[PDB]
Symmetry: D2
Subunit: 242 residues, 4 copies
């Protein structure tokens, strides 16, 4: 079983992703195409490269080209420092190949929005927010109920369990209105296995607290991504390239 | 002189803007093309239509197609309700014709970012922030100094002085890194007068307050223009 | 009734057309944006500008941005000079606003192909070729029969008669296979009146013999566009701008 | 050494090429993505896959996605049947990776035109036409002289000499005027070795004869490569 991605496999993956992104008019700078942009969620997912990104097999791997991750702390009243972490601005292009997924997880602080650029996006989520402490949270526009899962959702071997709570389904396409995924909601998505092209989606969200002189002292060592699956939640950061 | 835009002028202006937006893959739905998307900053700016959007003359008029304006209040701890207005997510596509401007102004709460999609964007701004309300504010990544203005910029007649404080300049093109304009910073921008195409820019910013997620958000004004006339021209577009 | 297009109307029309073309990646050079690119088929069609290109009213007006019109005579055996006029290469982008048409006509020498870039193209044609002299013409892939006209085809006032022979219908969209319109076939097309965008179509055809040191002596003064309507066939060239 | 391309390599090569084509708005239908769209010009060129399409090494391999290849015989006077083969309409999208080439060759009948869609195209050609068959040919707009080759062009190993006769050079970019390559002219092209993206070019040409509209068209060969090996690599792609 694969334990890493070869330099050739990785370079071709990111190069073709960056080329497709540019063709779609997403602003890609050299610095954005790095050894951290191609993500493998769990060591058991490197097996995705045994047959490759066009095998159409179910695995949790994807490319993220981040053009923006602005704290938006400047100008913020000091009195609001405690919750600045729920704000900020992040713009990234996500490229997911046929049959692949962005694994089940939720964010305590980050709210996201999706805009499909190419292909079709199958989003899976929990209409109800996870309970985070004895917090008295605000409400305004709760997540829509959505529809039940369609037929054809091949889940990654050994991870099917982590998708159990994501009962709601919505399929997004280019030209559709923006879709918002409120913070504290379990979610995941995949590119249909029969898709002729990789799924390309622009995500505009609040600040992304992920490992990679902090905006605020309290922001140091802050992880805002909690995955359901252990393999992904505990040990999914850096990408092993050999 | 012009006191309003004709129905035909408005329809062609927004129909072509929305068509260009769609060609550039921006998600445009019907409710986005409305009576307020074509903005004229002041009654004296309707004269921009005496010769049209391809006259290359300096006027402050533009189209904004907003695909998202999410409060992002859901899930936020009640304890942060007081400053939730500084957050949120807004996505809009701005179309500015040759020589036209988005006039000098600042936002107390909204921080923006620019991504040029078509054409080139000339940004004029003040690198030092203004103080709006609360004295003690946070700081992390101050606005860069950019460069001084280039020669030959044509400003709108009678609005020249309003640009005096925006001494820094940067010219953005497609493919460039995202440019951030922190809240409380005076800024403005134009499409070069000699541009072959209209300037098209995607703006990703915090919530856009335009007269509710929270009680205190009601009737909140977050756009302060330097020119008195420009403030007036932002309420409603006069379409004859 | 309108007798010409104002300089402002014309410049805005061509400028927005060239901008849209560039946005769609069609190579537009300054020389391609000229006073002949915006075409009005007949003096009775200038009325299209009484209410404008977004009035959605039926008129025969359009923009043609020609990036190529190559004789392809170079290297051709002298023995084939007699029929070089049926060859050549022409690449042009056609932009037609909601409800507007490219008027009924046929070409004796030019064969065309269509590739919709934006919007939807409603093509009207005669499945059978017009008879041009006692010619013994070649055959290989005759025009498909197509379907009958749909409901919603508002024809230009005073020209509805010229559309009578174009009995076959086909609706083209972006991503569809290339559609070929063989020479000697009456044809026309329009952008649906309810379209949210102007119809943008790339036409790749054989040489376009239209008024504007000839490739071949016999090519001088050669017109290959025969329109059904008199107003268009006799007096539709130059565009009157005032 | 490599004697064929692996199934996975071929699938990823064409799937990414077709995806890029679609993103660039080229009309790709299923029958266009086939076992002959990924071309390897010679058995010695399969080595291009030893390190891959992003190795930036000079090899003669490319993908061609043909959306149209119309004989244009319908309606043509029978009297012109003898030279109908010099006409017709072909539309194809060519994708060439960094440092890769479309090898030196000429067509007796096909005249082509290039429109760069993504990246930059370096064209090497002979401005003087070769004589193929008939002596008396027509002339109107001779190929321009272009410029001499720029410094540093890396050629495929063992194929260097085949480029000797293509002394003229032109570099084409997106938005440039269409470039015409008349029939009977030796030509070749590559994507710069340092290009950040694959070169994507739309070719509009007369009919592409590849082994019927007319009896005489059967088994017609209209591609003559300078390198003997390159001629061999054009028949069928070895996919293991
Ligand atoms: Mn997420
Ligand atoms: Mn602003
Ligand atoms: Mn025609
Ligand atoms: Mn060739």
């Amino acid at each position: 079983t694969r334990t890493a991605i070869s330099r050739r496999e990785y370079d071709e993956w990111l190069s073709e992703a960056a080329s497709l992104a540019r063709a779609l008019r997403y602003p890609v700078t050299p610095e954005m195409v790095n050894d951290s942009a191609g993500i493998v969620f769990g060591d058991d997912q490197y097996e995705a490269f045994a047959h490759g990104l066009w095998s159409r097999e179910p695995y949790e791997v994807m490319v993220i080209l981040e053009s923006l991750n602005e704290p938006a702390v400047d100008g913020l009243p000091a009195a609001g420092a405690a919750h600045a972490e729920y704000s900020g601005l992040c713009d990234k292009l996500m490229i997911v190949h046929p049959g692949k997924f962005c694994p089940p997880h939720f964010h305590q602080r980050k709210t996201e929005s999706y805009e499909v650029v190419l292909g079709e996006m199958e989003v899976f989520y929990a209409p109800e927010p996870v309970t985070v402490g004895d917090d008295d949270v605000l409400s305004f526009s709760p997540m829509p109920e959505g529809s039940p899962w369609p037929e054809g959702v091949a889940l990654p071997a050994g991870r099917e369990d982590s998708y159990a709570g994501l009962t709601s389904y919505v399929r997004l396409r280019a030209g559709d209105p923006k879709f918002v995924m409120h913070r504290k909601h379990l979610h995941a998505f995949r590119c249909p296995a029969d898709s002729p092209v990789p799924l390309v989606v622009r995500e505009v969200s609040t600040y992304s607290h992920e490992p990679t002189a902090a905006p605020l002292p309290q922001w140091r060592g802050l992880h805002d991504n909690t995955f359901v699956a252990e393999a992904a939640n505990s040990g999914r950061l850096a990408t092993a390239i050999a």
